[PDB]
């Protein structure tokens, strides 16, 4: 996110180079995708410009599916966001700057001079924070669609019991390909790791080589009624 600050006091961003864009495409095209590209993009476009991000997202290689999903996620995110919160802390006067909108944030009818003039002017309405937030959200989902990262979505929570989270855990993993040497320990550590804190404490306290039957019995046998952890 290259940005310059004129000595006179005129904040101006730095034009993007083909090195960053090309490189980004070189990797994605070199293999495909990964959990490192998600943060890399957000870190490289962190608070960047609305145009730069548009070009970088456009030179993703040619993922029509990702483009439609992203644009759809942004439009729906802005529509709903505006539905619940029609206004924001910090009104404006008649004849001055206007309020934000999914149409001006999408970077379609919005201009660089306007975008900057807004984020630079009060109230503090950053158009990049929302752009990167939504853009990153969709990118993460789209990538997980054809990536093993989807399993990362299966984590233990108070919304459901341990027996439930674990069920969908190995279920989603075996849903594609999970039958080689993972059942040896790779899976035992993954489940026990993402497993709730309560059970975890009993697992490490129970000892190594713990069998699913033992660990499971301890988790449900914990305390008395075996009632899972409370809810937030």
């Amino acid at each position: 996110m290259p940005i310059v600050q004129n000595l006179q006091g005129q904040m101006v961003h730095q034009a993007i180079s083909p090195r960053t864009l090309n490189a980004w495409v070189k990797v994605v095209e070199e293999k495909a995708f990964s959990p490192e590209v998600i943060p890399m993009f957000s870190a490289l476009s962190e608070g960047a410009t609305p145009q730069d991000l548009n070009t970088m997202l456009n030179t993703v290689g040619g993922h029509q599916a990702a483009m439609q999903m992203l644009k759809e996620t942004i439009n729906e995110e802005a529509a709903e966001w505006d539905r619940l919160h029609p206004v924001h802390a910090g009104p404006i006067a008649p004849g001055q700057m206007r309020e934000p909108r999914g149409s001006d944030i999408a970077g379609t009818t919005s201009t660089l001079q306007e975008q900057i003039g807004w984020m630079t002017h009060n109230p503090p309405i950053p158009v990049g924070e929302i752009y990167k937030r939504w853009i990153i959200l969709g990118l993460n989902k789209i990538v997980r669609m054809y990536s093993p990262t989807s399993i990362l979505d299966i984590r233990q929570g108070p919304k459901e019991p341990f027996r439930d989270y674990v069920d969908r855990f190995y279920k989603t993993l075996r849903a594609e390909q999970a039958s080689q040497e993972v059942k040896n320990a790779a899976t035992e550590t993954l489940l026990v790791q993402n497993a709730n804190p309560d059970c975890k404490t009993i697992l490490k306290a129970l000892g190594p080589g713990a069998t699913l039957e033992e660990m499971m019995t301890a988790c449900q046998g914990v305390g008395g009624p075996g009632h899972k952890a409370r809810v937030l």
Side-chain angles (χ1 to χ4, degrees):
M1 179 238 192
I3 306 291
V4 229
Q5 191 198 313
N6 283 300
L7 313 188
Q8 316 226 306
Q10 267 186 114
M11 287 258 285
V12 303
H13 78 276
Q14 223 125 225
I16 224 143
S17 256
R19 307 252 261 289
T20 278
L21 317 184
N22 290 30
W24 196 104
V25 185
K26 151 269 253 272
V27 171
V28 145
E29 90 92 354
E30 255 285 35
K31 194 278 199 139
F33 268 125
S34 17
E36 317 229 323
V37 181
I38 272 298
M40 183 247 304
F41 219 147
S42 218
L44 259 128
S45 65
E46 55 193 340
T49 32
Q51 187 219 337
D52 273 9
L53 260 169
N54 266 52
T55 277
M56 304 151 82
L57 102 86
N58 279 16
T59 187
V60 80
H63 298 62
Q64 54 106 341
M67 299 286 103
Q68 61 185 27
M69 201 94 98
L70 149 60
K71 161 261 292 190
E72 175 149 310
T73 262
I74 296 258
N75 255 104
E76 69 186 13
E77 273 289 335
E80 58 209 35
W81 156 249
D82 257 309
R83 162 139 145 78
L84 317 188
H85 303 263
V87 94
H88 330 288
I92 21 162
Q96 227 143 99
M97 270 292 174
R98 332 184 77 168
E99 112 189 86
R101 213 68 163 198
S103 188
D104 291 15
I105 303 155
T108 25
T109 331
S110 216
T111 340
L112 279 88
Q113 60 187 116
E114 264 179 318
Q115 243 106 344
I116 268 291
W118 241 319
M119 58 146 106
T120 58
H121 284 13
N122 286 42
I125 303 165
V127 115
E129 283 250 43
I130 58 187
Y131 214 52
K132 58 100 160 207
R133 270 274 198 73
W134 292 329
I135 283 261
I136 286 291
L137 236 63
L139 187 53
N140 198 346
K141 220 163 80 188
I142 297 144
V143 138
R144 123 182 129 71
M145 238 301 239
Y146 41 76
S147 292
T149 65
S150 196
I151 286 268
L152 94 90
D153 106 292
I154 295 110
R155 110 186 222 290
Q156 78 88 16
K159 226 159 269 207
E160 39 62 55
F162 184 55
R163 195 81 176 283
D164 272 25
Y165 139 87
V166 59
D167 141 70
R168 310 288 278 286
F169 191 99
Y170 58 73
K171 178 116 63 129
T172 316
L173 194 68
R174 227 122 162 161
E176 10 171 342
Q177 156 154 115
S179 325
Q180 175 129 67
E181 58 181 30
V182 296
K183 59 232 149 104
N184 213 109
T187 282
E188 111 183 291
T189 289
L190 238 293
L191 173 63
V192 152
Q193 178 236 326
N194 273 311
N196 40 299
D198 281 6
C199 169
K200 184 169 55 150
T201 278
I202 285 144
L203 270 27
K204 50 118 270 180
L206 183 104
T211 337
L212 228 63
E213 309 209 346
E214 309 225 71
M215 285 153 38
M216 184 67 235
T217 282
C219 177
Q220 88 187 15
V222 72
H227 217 67
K228 72 178 210 231
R230 219 215 292 281
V231 75
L232 216 122

